[model samples]
Each structure stands twice: as C-alpha cells, then as structure tokens.
Target: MHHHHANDTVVVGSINFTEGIIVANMVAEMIEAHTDLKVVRKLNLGGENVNFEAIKRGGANNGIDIYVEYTGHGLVDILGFPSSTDPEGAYETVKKEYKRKWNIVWLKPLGFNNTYTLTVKDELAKQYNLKTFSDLAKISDKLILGATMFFLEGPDGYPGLQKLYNFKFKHTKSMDMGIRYTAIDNNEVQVIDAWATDGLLVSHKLKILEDDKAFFPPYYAAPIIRQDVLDKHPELKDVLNKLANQISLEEMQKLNYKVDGEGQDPAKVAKEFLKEKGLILQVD
Candidate 1:
C-alpha cells in the first residue's frame, strides 16, 4: 500500500561519506517521525564548495533544507575568518555573519568538538606526561607528525598551531585523513592529527593531547539551515537543537564505530540511533 503523500518531502543534504550520510539520515528520520513533513536525503552533495553551491543556487532547493556543518569549517571556509579558541564566541560571530551575509541560519551547536587533535601512542603520552600540546612541544624533535593534506596548512591547520604554540616537529607528512590513522597504528608516524569525533582514536588507543595553549578553534557540529526553511517551520529549530545538544563525543564515537568498525550501513546505523533515541517510530 502506498501511504506516502505529497508535502511529505523535506530534503536534507550532506556531503558524500559515511559521516555525512549517517548524520543526514538521522535528522531525516527525526523529522519524519515527529513532523508531518516527509524526509528525503540528498547525500554526496560533493565537497564543501559544491555543497555551498547547492545551497546558494537552490539546485536541489526543496530537497536540501538542512545540513550538518562544523563551526570551524564554517568560519575558515565560508567566512574567511581566522580560527579562535573561544568556541562560543566563534559560534556567535559566525552565526551572525552567516545569517547576515548568506541568510544561512546555524542551529545550536552540538556538545561535541570536532577540532583537530594531536594523537600519540598511549604509552608514550603516559611516559612523557604529555597531557597537552605544550607538553608535546618538548618532545616534538623526536616525533614525526602526520596530518591530512587539507590540514597541513589550511586555515585551521599546522601553521595555526605553530604560530600559536611556537612548536616545531621533527618532520611533518601530509596524507589522506583515512590513511593517517593506519599510519599511526603501524608506528609509521609517532604523532598524527585527527578529528576529535573520529572513532580511530578509540580503536587505535591513541591519546589525544590537549591544546592547552588554545591554538585550535572549536569545531562544534551544528545544523546549517536556510532562513526560509526555518521561518516556515519554527518548531524544527527546537527539535533539531534538542538533538544537537544531546550528542557528545562518546556518542559520536559509538556511532562512528558502528559505521567504520562494524561495517554497518550508515543509513541502518542512523535509523538505529533515531529509534534508540525515541525520535523515530519506524525504520525503512
């Protein structure tokens, strides 16, 4: 029986990948379960530039009403602003700027921070008492640093770290973000840059050194919704904001583990999350 009806469609967009798909699916499920709107996912909307273009041009306009985004990425990529240690301050500034400039309203930021971290061997971190990046600076001469190509000198990358902390590594190698984890696991690199939300940190037993000097800006995950959509559905803001604040790094890690380690389908995993959270009545 085809019970689906018109006006059930609410298009949600995200970049291509497990994380994006999972997040998009989760949000879609939530909207569908709680509201009269039907959810349609527009996954793999290309990289950052293309995703931005998708929203700007309204290509899949009705289908891409919302998307998950990081605050730091929003600042550096969208606004050309420098990273700031004050996360709340950065969020407010970026939100205001985006609303004024792009008519893109950023929702409440999730509790999680997706900031890049310097990951080292668990034992090495313990032995050296390396709880912070400043602690790592003393031993930087002996370690080889690995990071994603984009993070080597991107707005929120090593250059920012070096400038803020006056730290220099023995060597720095740029690799794909995925490969950096394996390299760290195999001891090919002593220290590697990783996102705080990554499951590999837990899987590899890597220790994330704190940026005590506050070099890295906060990268809280949030929903980037178009103003028109928000205006039309004011209740959606509270629902999504509630979901956003509920997710923590540990919760994110568990979800990533299901996708990366267990090899479960991202949509399935997302469905399970929505169900477990009591946000969805059914999964398909």
Candidate 2:
C-alpha cells in the first residue's frame, strides 16, 4: 500500500524549458499515480540557481517539494567543486555537500547523463576516421562547430574542450540549442556540441563523436528534494528512487525520440513509458 502525507499540496518545480518541464511533469504524474498525494506542477521555474533558491526558501512554505537537477552542474556551478575524473565520486561528493549545506535529499540518479558532447555526421566521422577530439583537431580546418551561447563560454565549454583536447574547431557558431541542432541537420554545420541524453539527436540521426579523452564531466539527472518535504511524506523518497533506478540511457533515448522525432506530447509519452515499465499502473 502507498502512503499519504497529511498535507495534500505538493509542488514540483522545474527549470524553464521543454526538457525541464517534461521531466517535472513525469515526476508529478508518477507521484500522483502511485501515491495518495495532491501534485501541483510548477513549470518554467527558471535556471539551476532559481530552482535551488526556490527549495532553499520555499521548503515548507511555498509547496515546492522537488526539482530535477544534474549532478555535474550542481558540483561545478552550485558547489564550486572542481571537476573530477570519477563520475560516481563526483555525484557522491555533491550529494554529501548538498545534504550537509542545505539539508537537501538527492534521490537515486537516473542513469542517463546529459553531459556536453560533440556530434558529427556518421558518414563524415567514418570517412575521416574521426574517433576522437584530436582527430577532429587534425582536420580542424575542415569542420564547423555549432553550439549554444552558454557552451561557448562555460568552463566546460569550448575553452575546456580546447584545453583538454589541445585542439579547436575550424569555425564555431553560437546559437540557441534548438537552432544549433537545425544547423547540424541542414549540413550548415559539420559538427555540434550537444547534450548526450538530448532526445533530438536520436530523431535527427546525428552521430555523437565519442569523447575518447573524456573531456566533459558526467551530468547525471537526479531528483533534488527538500528534506522537510521528505519528512512530511517519507514514502516519496522510495517512489522517486524506484523510478530513477528503472530509467536508463536507452529508455531516455527512446522517450526523447518520441518527443523530438515523433512529435508526441511529452506528458503522454512520459505516462505511457511509466505504465509500460510497470512504474505506475495504467489508469482506465
């Protein structure tokens, strides 16, 4: 039997964007379906800092129960921790810091990682024998890179890429994330920086270049919740954790493919995925 908290209100917050909204909705739907709780989804809650602030300030007062976060981002940007070679260690370190600093409880991380990545045309990669950043750098004069504005300047962005790989692209174009993907699809850009778990890549058939040198850190997705909220509804921890463990890279790719390629409604896709996985029973 599922447990119910005395408080009926539960606010699920997410960063302001389609990806974040989709994740937030997924969590809200599962919690509502599997537990006796009232779920209020607060979508478009702004960036990482905003979500953290919401939880810090509104832990009990504003009903913001949980939000999705990336472990690497939390470590580098939030906690000011240096990037580490070990992904699991990075996650645990951040988890410890958050728990100690703000009393936040990070649930089991969904195995999917959205770390920054480089992708090129499969044919181009095959033809040139480009298996690593060094290989790309050797042909830097022949490639154009498409990336987000943030990526161009972030510590983990081009600067970091260049520092780690000892090479930079021939040309670089900074645009909105959506536009960057379009540029790659149109062949206007020979390569692009992307999120490893982004659904768009599966739909677009763009081949992600392997980071043979592991330049970028892992950005595992996890649910970050306020401790008091968990205390109020202890069952939430297990329910969310169960859902996290069941999610994997392949499952994430498929879900992303559905939205990015098939144009399916995200909420509908998420519900169907949860039901298929037996995470939540299908409702009549």
Candidate 3:
C-alpha cells in the first residue's frame, strides 16, 4: 500500500551518487529544521531524466519539489547546449535557459566544480603515453571503460564524449559511483569517468586525462527547484541559499573521503558538516 505524506510535505530528490545524495540529505535536513513543511526524501532517484522529469511533470505520486543539480550537466545533458569553460557564463546560461524553458530556479552554487574527468591508472597512462583525452582516443578501441549508467547514456557523458573525440572504446561496463575504482584497480577496465572532487582519485593517485577538446563544461552544484515550489514557499530560497559559497573543492573532497575512503555514511558526513557549519543544531 502506498501512503503519501500530507499535502504540505516537500519531496527532495538526488541522483544515485554519493555527492548528490549527500547534498540532498543536507537540503532535507535544512527544510525540516527551518520550515513547518514536512520533508519526504526520495534520494538516489536515478539520473538526470528521472530527477528532472519528476519535478517537471510528476503530479503527486512521484513529484520531486526540489533537488541539487550541476550547471554543466544542465547545459549539456538536459539542454543539449555547447560547453563553456567560463564558470559564470555556464551557470548564467543554464539558469536562464531552465527558467525560460521549464520554470525552474537555480539557486546560488555550493562553491565547487565537480566536473567529469576521464581517468586511468598511473601505470596505464605512462605505458600508453597518454596525457589527454585525445591521446586516449587514439588507442580507445583497445581500452575498456567503466562508468555509471547515467554517464554511459547521457549526452554530456560517454555518447557525446565519444562523438566529439571519435572514440570507440573496446568495451564498456556500466557500474555505480565508487565501483569504477575497483574495476580499474583490478584491470577490468582501463578507463573511468570520475568526478573532479572524488576523494579516491587522490588516494589512488590516478591520472586524470585532460579534455584537450574541451568537451565538458564547468559543473557547479546548486539547488534547482520547480518555480511553483518556490512561489508557494518563497522562504525556501533564503534557507537554501544559506549553503551558497559554503563548500569548496577541498572541503568536498574531504567530505567525500569520509564516505568513499573512510566508509562513513553519507548522512552522518552531511549532518556533521551542517553541524560544523552551524547550519544545523547539534543534537546527540
């Protein structure tokens, strides 16, 4: 039996990844603590399509009122727009386009660019003389790629990257967020699509291939909410904006390390962060 929360409940969503879910939890905690509206978390809600469409079209059963999304992912994956190296430009473009097209609002970013990177082990990079994505493209047909299902399918992800670079990877396996490291370490896959702030990249000393063609745009994380949701509850804007410019790349990596490297729960890490920032009260 499916039972929905009261109509006043706000549904929060996130993609199926560590960082995404962590941010979603933060938002959920913030809303619960700061507002009278109850929160119903639908975290790890698949990829871009699922999250975006749920917010855009879901009536009640599957509605997602708010979620965090990346600017580059919005521009390329969702809008099918060209890449831009300028962070401010990219953010502005997505904000304008999403508002115009979908009536969504992109709040200020959490202050980190979690862009995608094509990475390989140091030994493989050295052996192949690989320094950039172009280098990998030359020998791509012989290499296997381990990536998330969303990356494998999204336009801003593998398909677009392959098209732009003329790459034909020998084989590709769809894996979840942290499993790529395991696949690469076991030599199961020669390449992986990694995020810029992944903690394991430092711990594993992986070689991140340069996107010489500039295929990917800057990905700044921000809360994207249906305009209707904001219209109904304008106070949510200031409450969420409390996180603006709060997290940096270094801080995010350390947060991720607590989960990916130290095996801590994402909720604990997120709560600890909110508590440390005085965004949430410490309750033990």
Q: Which residue pairs in model 3 clash with each other? A: none
How many residue pairs of model 2 clash at the backbone? 0
Q: Per-residue alpha-carbon lDDT of model 1 for 1-284, expressed as tens digits?
A: 00000254557878765666777787877777667876667764446555566666442454467888788777766787876878888899889998998898888876687676888989889888989999998878888888777667654578878777776788798887477777878888889876666666787898888989877667888878888777777777877776767678888877878898888888888888877876666553
Task: List where candidate 3 sits over 4 angstroms from the true fold.
Answer: 1-7, 58-61, 120-192, 207-212
lDDT tens digits, residues 110-217, model 2?
A: 777766678887888888998777788788777788877777876567887878876656778887738887888898888887766667776677677767777766
lDDT of 3 by residue, 1-284 (tens): 00000237788987677787788888888887778878888854455668888878643567788888888878877898877888899999999999999999999999988877899999999999999999999999999999877788876678889999999898889998578888898999999987777878878768888888888888899998888888788899999999999999878888888887899999889888999989978772
Each model's lDDT comes to 0.75, 0.76, 0.83
Candidate with more favorable, higher lDDT: 1 or 2: 2
The lDDT, on a scale of 0 to 1, for candidate 3 is: 0.83
Error of 2 at 31 (Å): 1.4
Clashes of each: 2, 0, 0
TM-score of every candidate relative to the true structure: 0.88, 0.89, 0.75
Worst 10 residues of 3 by lDDT: 1-10
User: lDDT score, residue 225, model 2?
Assistant: 88
Error of 1 at 132 (Å): 1.1
- Superposition TM-score, candidate 1 onto the true structure: 0.88
**Which candidate number would show the highest lDDT if scored against the true structure?**
3
The CA lDDT at 200 in model 3 is 87
Between candidates 1 and 3, the one scoring higher on lDDT is 3
Q: Which pairs of residues collide in candidate 2?
A: none
